[PDB]
């Protein structure tokens, strides 16, 4: 569904904790409910 890629090259990679930072919720964020990346799991 949603993948992580680099800012200077297109390479879709799985979303991990190394790639992502926790941020406060914004209303323009995508509420995803079917497939959830592992850093957003419990």
């Amino acid at each position: 569904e949603w993948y992580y890629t680099g800012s200077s090259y297109y390479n879709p990679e799985p979303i991990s904790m190394a790639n992502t930072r926790y941020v406060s919720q914004d209303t323009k964020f995508e509420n995803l409910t079917t497939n959830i990346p592992p850093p957003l799991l419990n």
Partner: protein, 48 residues
């Protein structure tokens, strides 16, 4: 994010006021306009 979400209309109004305020910044008291006029005056003074 909460401050920007709660104060969006105030931000837009202040930005519009600041962008409409630069219409009258073309007087002699402004430093940048004085520099523009100084450049034009130097260009004229060389020919003079």
């Amino acid at each position: 994010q909460q401050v920007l979400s709660e104060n969006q209309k105030q931000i837009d109004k202040k930005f519009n006021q600041a962008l409409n305020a630069m219409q009258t910044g073309f007087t002699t008291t402004n430093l940048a306009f004085s520099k523009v006029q100084d450049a034009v005056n130097a260009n004229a003074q060389a020919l003079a």
